[PDB]
């Protein structure tokens, strides 16, 4: 059916799903889980950032036999950040299963230490392509019991520099391995890989788009000189759990952040003219609730964020959509100078939406 209980998972795994607060299957979960449970390969078109993990980790965990100390399932991802995210979700979902071991290994984890780690039981490996192939070829990661492999964001896994690495990985695995493949896009390389390796895959085309539905949108006619005063008013009236305040330049981000800080606001800031590692650190602290508001440029999923402020109104309708759209939040407020008035109506039309005058 369409309830988690319908999939007849182990009670331990369902308890894991319950404790995640996952009440009803998402559409990608509804489409992926019963087919993957049967053993069929999957070919899925889903956007990046879509909650694919929640779909494929469940049948992966259901497939495990914890009476065996062997690696039995692998998830291959193109970035260190996705590896961390997926392994965390996997560790939480499986926390009732009694002895299930999940390990993440990337170019960003220490190779010596990871090798020592693989001396002990590991059932599930989450990894970047380069690191896991290196580990398999060194004999450290033994993969003759792997019965399932997931490829997440397969287009990035199968780009020019990586296609052979992925091919080599696949050739070390039991020929009958179940494959679950997820991708936003389907270049020739992914098409080739598909044809060679996937076996009559179940096809899923679940492309959730960014939408404005459910987002209340307002604008306020303001001069540039008045913008912080207007911000003062907003943050003295709304209930803000967390907010994101977008500006159109790195210079404006810093100046604003430093200004409102001096005025007693809680904020971090992030923009283009910073080291990436610094950027990641700040964003991670914002997510963990160490400030209330993030001031930033366009660089982009944080549940606590209930208000987005466009302190500078964007030039492009697509930028606007990325700033306040959601896949499937609360309030968006636009500060509009005279010179923004054209883009306001234009972006409104392009996106087929409504941005109402703010209530007094």
């Amino acid at each position: 059916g369409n309830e988690f209980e319908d999939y007849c998972l182990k009670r331990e795994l369902l308890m894991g799903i319950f404790e995640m607060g996952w009440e009803k299957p998402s559409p990608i979960q509804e489409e992926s889980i019963p087919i993957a449970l049967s053993g069929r390969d999957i070919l899925a078109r889903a956007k990046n950032g879509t909650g694919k993990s929640g779909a494929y980790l469940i049948p992966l965990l259901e497939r495990l036999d914890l009476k065996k100390d062997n690696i039995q399932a692998m998830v291959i991802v193109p970035t260190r950040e996705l590896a961390l995210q997926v392994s965390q979700i996997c560790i939480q979902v499986s926390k009732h299963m009694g002895g299930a071991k999940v390990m993440a290994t990337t170019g960003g984890t220490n190779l010596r230490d990871d090798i020592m780690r693989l001396d002990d039981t590991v059932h599930v490996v989450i990894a970047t392509p380069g690191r896991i192939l290196d580990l398999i070829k060194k004999g450290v990661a033994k993969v003759d019991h792997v019965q399932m492999i997931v490829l997440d964001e397969a287009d990035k896994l199968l780009s020019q520099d990586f296609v052979q690495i992925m091919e080599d990985i696949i050739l070390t695995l039991p020929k009958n391995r179940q494959i679950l493949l997820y991708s936003a896009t389907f270049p020739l390389s992914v098409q080739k890989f598909m044809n060679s390796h996937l076996q009559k895959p179940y096809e899923i085309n679940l492309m959730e788009e960014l939408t404005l539905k459910g987002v209340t949108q307002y604008y306020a006619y303001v001069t540039e000189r008045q913008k912080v005063h207007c911000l003062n008013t907003l943050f003295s009236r709304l209930q803000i759990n967390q907010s994101i305040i977008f500006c159109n330049s790195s210079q404006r981000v810093e100046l604003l952040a430093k200004k409102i800080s001096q005025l007693g606001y809680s904020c971090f800031y992030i923009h283009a003219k910073m080291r990436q590692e610094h950027r990641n650190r700040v964003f991670h602290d914002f997510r963990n609730g160490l400030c209330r508001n993030l001031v930033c440029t366009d660089l982009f999923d944080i549940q606590a964020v209930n208000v987005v402020i466009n302190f500078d109104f964007p030039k492009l309708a697509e930028t606007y959509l990325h700033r306040i759209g959601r896949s499937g939040l609360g309030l968006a407020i636009n500060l509009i100078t005279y010179d923004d008035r054209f883009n306001l109506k234009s972006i409104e039309e392009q996106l087929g939406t409504e941005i109402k005058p703010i209530p007094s």
Partner: peptide, 23 residues
């Protein structure tokens, strides 16, 4: 390029509040 009007000629207190209108 230049330094913003709200940084230089901005408020020196959070209580400096203006009316909100789209009109």
């Amino acid at each position: 390029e230049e330094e913003p009007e709200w940084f230089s000629a901005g408020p020196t207190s959070q209580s400096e509040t203006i009316e909100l209108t789209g009109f």
